[PDB]
Amino acid sequence: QRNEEKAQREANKKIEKQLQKDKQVYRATHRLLLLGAGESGKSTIVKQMRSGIFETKFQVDKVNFHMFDVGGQRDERRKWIQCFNDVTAIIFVVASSSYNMVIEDNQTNRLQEALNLFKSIWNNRWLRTISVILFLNKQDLLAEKVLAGKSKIEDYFPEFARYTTPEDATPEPEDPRVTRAKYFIRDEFLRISTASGDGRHYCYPHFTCAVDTENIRRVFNDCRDIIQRMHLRQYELL
Amino acid sequence: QLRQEAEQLKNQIRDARKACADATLSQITNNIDPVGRIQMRTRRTLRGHLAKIYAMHWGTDSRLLVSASQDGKLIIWDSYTTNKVHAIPLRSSWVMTCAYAPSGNYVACGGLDNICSIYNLKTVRVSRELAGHTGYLSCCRFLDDNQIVTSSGDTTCALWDIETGQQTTTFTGHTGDVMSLSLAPDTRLFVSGACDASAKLWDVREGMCRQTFTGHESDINAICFFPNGNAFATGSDDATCRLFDLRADQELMTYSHDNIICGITSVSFSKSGRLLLAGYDDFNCNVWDALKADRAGVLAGHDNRVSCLGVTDDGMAVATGSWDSFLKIWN
Amino acid sequence: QARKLVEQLKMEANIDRIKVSKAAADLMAYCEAHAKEDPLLTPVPASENPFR
Amino acid sequence: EVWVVGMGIVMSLIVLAIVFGNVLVITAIAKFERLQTVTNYFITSLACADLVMGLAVVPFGAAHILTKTWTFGNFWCEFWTSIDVLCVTASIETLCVIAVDRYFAITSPFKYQSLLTKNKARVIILMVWIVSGLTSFLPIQMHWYRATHQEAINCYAEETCCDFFTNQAYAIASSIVSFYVPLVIMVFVYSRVFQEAKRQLQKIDKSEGRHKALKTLGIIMGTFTLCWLPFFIVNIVHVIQDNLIRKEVYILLNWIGYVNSGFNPLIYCRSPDFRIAFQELL
Numbered sequence: 031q032r033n034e035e036k037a038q039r040e041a042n043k044k045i046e047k048q049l050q051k052d053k054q055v056y057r058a059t060h061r062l063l064l065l066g067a068g069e070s071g072k073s074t075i076v077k078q079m080r081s082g083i084f085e086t087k088f089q090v091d092k093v094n095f096h097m098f099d100v101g102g103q104r105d106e107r108r109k110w111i112q113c114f115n116d117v118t119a120i121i122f123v124v125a126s127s128s129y130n131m132v133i134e135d136n137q138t139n140r141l142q143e144a145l146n147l148f149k150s151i152w153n154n155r156w157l158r159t160i161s162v163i164l165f166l167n168k169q170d171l172l173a174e175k176v177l178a179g180k181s182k183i184e185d186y187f188p189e190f191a192r193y194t195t196p197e198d199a200t201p202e203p204e205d206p207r208v209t210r211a212k213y214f215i216r217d218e219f220l221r222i223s224t225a226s227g228d229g230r231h232y233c234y235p236h237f238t239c240a241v242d243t244e245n246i247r248r249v250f251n252d253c254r255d256i257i258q259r260m261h262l263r264q265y266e267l268l
Numbered sequence: 269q270l271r272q273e274a275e276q277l278k279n280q281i282r283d284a285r286k287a288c289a290d291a292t293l294s295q296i297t298n299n300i301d302p303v304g305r306i307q308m309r310t311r312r313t314l315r316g317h318l319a320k321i322y323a324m325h326w327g328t329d330s331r332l333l334v335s336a337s338q339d340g341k342l343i344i345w346d347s348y349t350t351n352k353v354h355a356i357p358l359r360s361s362w363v364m365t366c367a368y369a370p371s372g373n374y375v376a377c378g379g380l381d382n383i384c385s386i387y388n389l390k391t392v393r394v395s396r397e398l399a400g401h402t403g404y405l406s407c408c409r410f411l412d413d414n415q416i417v418t419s420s421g422d423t424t425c426a427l428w429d430i431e432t433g434q435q436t437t438t439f440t441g442h443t444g445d446v447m448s449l450s451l452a453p454d455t456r457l458f459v460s461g462a463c464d465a466s467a468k469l470w471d472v473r474e475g476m477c478r479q480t481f482t483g484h485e486s487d488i489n490a491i492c493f494f495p496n497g498n499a500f501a502t503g504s505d506d507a508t509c510r511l512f513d514l515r516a517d518q519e520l521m522t523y524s525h526d527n528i529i530c531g532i533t534s535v536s537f538s539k540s541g542r543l544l545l546a547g548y549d550d551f552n553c554n555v556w557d558a559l560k561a562d563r564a565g566v567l568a569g570h571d572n573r574v575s576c577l578g579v580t581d582d583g584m585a586v587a588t589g590s591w592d593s594f595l596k597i598w599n
Numbered sequence: 600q601a602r603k604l605v606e607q608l609k610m611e612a613n614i615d616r617i618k619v620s621k622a623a624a625d626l627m628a629y630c631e632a633h634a635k636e637d638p639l640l641t642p643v644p645a646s647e648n649p650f651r
Numbered sequence: 652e653v654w655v656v657g658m659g660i661v662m663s664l665i666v667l668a669i670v671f672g673n674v675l676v677i678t679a680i681a682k683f684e685r686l687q688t689v690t691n692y693f694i695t696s697l698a699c700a701d702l703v704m705g706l707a708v709v710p711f712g713a714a715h716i717l718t719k720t721w722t723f724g725n726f727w728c729e730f731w732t733s734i735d736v737l738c739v740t741a742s743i744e745t746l747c748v749i750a751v752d753r754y755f756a757i758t759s760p761f762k763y764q765s766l767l768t769k770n771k772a773r774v775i776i777l778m779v780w781i782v783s784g785l786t787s788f789l790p791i792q793m794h795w796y797r798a799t800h801q802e803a804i805n806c807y808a809e810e811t812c813c814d815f816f817t818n819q820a821y822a823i824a825s826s827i828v829s830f831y832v833p834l835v836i837m838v839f840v841y842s843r844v845f846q847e848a849k850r851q852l853q854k855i856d857k858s859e860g861r862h863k864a865l866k867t868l869g870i871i872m873g874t875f876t877l878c879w880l881p882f883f884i885v886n887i888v889h890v891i892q893d894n895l896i897r898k899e900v901y902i903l904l905n906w907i908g909y910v911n912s913g914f915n916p917l918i919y920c921r922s923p924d925f926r927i928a929f930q931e932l933l
């Protein structure tokens with residue numbers, strides 16, 4: 031019986047060595063979750079940045095980022111959202127040009143549905159410490175719709191009527207109206223984000239576009255900021 | 269339209285169930301002596317999982333168990349000697365369940381990939397990749413070495429044949445996505461609990477849900493037959509565990525404590541059926557006295573939330589695997 | 600869709616049910632009869648326990 | 652009598668507090684599996700150094716100062732001096748290592764997880780303890796630190812009294828290695844960490860526009876500096892010129908430096924996880 035025990039111990043040692051070798055790789059790799067409204071052009075971001083699940087691995091600055099995206103689970107209830115607890119960040123994709131597109135029908139707005147989804151993600155008992163990277167696609171489409179008449183933000187969003195452009199705003203090298211609309215949408219997302227939790231996790235709103243291809247650098251910088259803030263708060267400096 | 273007829277049938281069912289009820293289980297089991305306090309200490313702690321653990325399954329011999337984690341390693345343990353017999357890399361990192369075949373030759377696991385993977389231990393390599401579920405599958409169990417039942421997020425349970433790789437039959441008509449599943453000791457029947465707070469009983473051969481139990485208020489995360497096979501206990505996010513009886517067609521007792529409000533993740537029964545062990549979200553799995561619904565003991569070894577809780581077939585030990593990647597053997 | 604639901608409920612209607620007292624007595628009798636052969640219920644002797 | 656007894660009470664309280672805090676933090680780290688981490692391994696090394704200090708050199712030093720003589724053997728007073736140097740050097744260098752670990756964690760986030768491992772933590776702790784042990788025992792035990800003037804020779808030949816007399820070279824080297832290099836390293840890494848913290852705070856203020864780091868780094872630097880800097884300045888000064896520095900001031904500043912061992916667990920073990928672990932322990 032001693033020979034069997036010795037062989038089993040040798041097998042255990044081999045499995046433990048393999049487990050350590052895999053642990054090095056697992057700790058090296060950072061995981062991201064891609065969650066979007068569905069019609070917000072998440073695929074266009076995937077093409078530029080890079081079964082129900084779709085996993086792509088992109089590395090930048092010798093850092094391995096592994097992105098997970100799920101589209102098969104279209105149910106409103108999200109019981110798989112609780113598994114992405116160790117992910118570095120949740121990439122949120124929202125089409126800011128979908129305010130006018132009302133909805134199946136009877137939905138208030140696609141942007142309103144995205145706001146509700148973002149609120150549900152933020153106010154989750156499990157994703158309390160998971161930060162969200164927010165991408166607003168179709169900035170060109172939003173500009174085309176806003177500059178064109180007969181489609182006003184205030185018609186669908188009454189809060190836009192009593193709104194002014196932020197003083198501490200950085201316009202791109204834009205019209206006043208499109209800038210006001212973009213910053214109103216960003217402020218809506220930020221007011222949804224900041225109120226629930228403080229310090230545990232932050233929202234990073236980026237005004238990306240289909241033509242833009244620097245989203246990988248933005249995601250890298252956002253992940254670096256997220257880990258720095260996590261480490262700073264763990265040591266009680268931030 | 270037909271909704272009025274459905275409501276009338278539901279009212280008739282409720283009236284029949286109320287008329288069948290004469291006395292509660294408490295009124296009968298209050299006379300018998302209580303179980304008393306029970307203290308359980310972690311005999312062995314199993315170490316080596318990189319990430320959080322979702323599901324485990326004790327072997328038939330009670331010597332071995334298989335554990336699933338998000339790092340992709342499907343580790344098979346020797347619970348007596350605390351040794352890793354095998355470690356199986358997985359195609360998808362995200363896994364929600366695992367199973368151990370009664371013969372011990374096969375091990376099945378699945379996750380968010382919507383695919384049930386079956387691995388042959390003695391030949392490790394993937395024997396068959398089962399596809400046909402549109403939603404994520406949450407639990408897998410083995411009837412025999414050839415038939416496997418998977419519970420998916422498609423709100424439909426399916427029975428597969430490993431040799432042909434196609435579903436022999438499917439179980440439909442259940443509103444929410446199912447997360448828990450338990451087979452009968454005779455393997456003729458099984459149950460599933462979904463997010464619609466209703467746990468249904470199916471017949472594997474017939475393929476129809478004979479009875480439906482809707483006592484819970486929130487999504488059902490756990491389910492498990494009584495060892496007799498005539499009863500089963502369900503755990504939900506409503507912080508309540510309820511014991512349902514098939515012949516009585518309703519719940520007998522509810523296991524709730526006012527101090528704790530965290531939901532139940534996994535439940536299991538002792539060999540005699542007297543003790544109902546239910547994990548909780550508060551990092552503590554509790555031990556209930558099934559007959560009197562009085563909590564006997566609490567296990568506090570784990571740090572993170574428990575996700576799986578099983579009892580050996582011989583009844584010697586209870587294994588709980590939590591999100592801190594540590595699986596503890598209790599006795 | 601509703602036809603399937605009403606048919607299923609009609610099928611569930613005609614099921615014989617035993618009084619809750621009888622079922623509770625059966626579960627209690629099972630628990631009493633199998634109480635002895637339970638390692639969890641009765642603390643296992645140290646020599647008998649495989650783990651320790 | 653009362654004045655002598657009054658000192659006895661304060662040294663008894665000091666040694667009791669140091670031992671209690673160090674054993675409590677070591678027990679908290681060892682008991683629970685969640686608390687073991689590379690940084691917590693460094694905390695364990697610091698706690699072990701401070702516990703050895705409190706068990707060995709604080710009570711013997713108190714007995715020496717109260718009884719005004721060394722009843723024990725000459726080899727034993729040399730051993731006491733070696734253990735004192737070892738404890739001080741190990742504690743300060745472990746503090747420096749903790750500061751370096753925090754600086755690497757904040758400055759290089761992606762590489763920090765792969766840079767520091769359990770094995771690397773073990774080898775760093777072993778190297779720190781090895782260099783501390785060298786600096787302590789190798790000069791003292793090999794008798795390279797004894798002074799040349801007859802005042803030290805009379806004290807070292809006699810058995811009743813055994814005080815500290817040191818060379819210029821050994822005192823300078825010991826002070827440098829024990830305090831000044833760790834001081835420079837800690838100051839630099841904490842300045843960089845403060846800059847990164849204020850940068851992150853500025854970024855947080857930039858978006859969603861419509862202190863704590865300063866206080867934390869202030870207490871961390873202030874405790875260590877106020878405890879050790881005067882004593883090492885005196886170490887340099889009494890060697891440079893012997894007249895001004897009296898023995899009483901030297902011993903007083905040495906004990907003020909000793910109290911840093913007791914103060915350390917309050918600073919480095921003040922986390923909610925540690926507080927929960929302490930509540931579980933007692």
Ligand SMILES: CN[C@@H]1CCc2c(ccc(O)c2O)[C@H]1O
Pocket residue numbers: 732735736739740815822825826829905
């Ligand atoms: C007897 N007291 C000793 C003597 C000299 C000395 C101390 C501490 C750290 C050092 O680097 C030293 O050189 C003191 O604790």
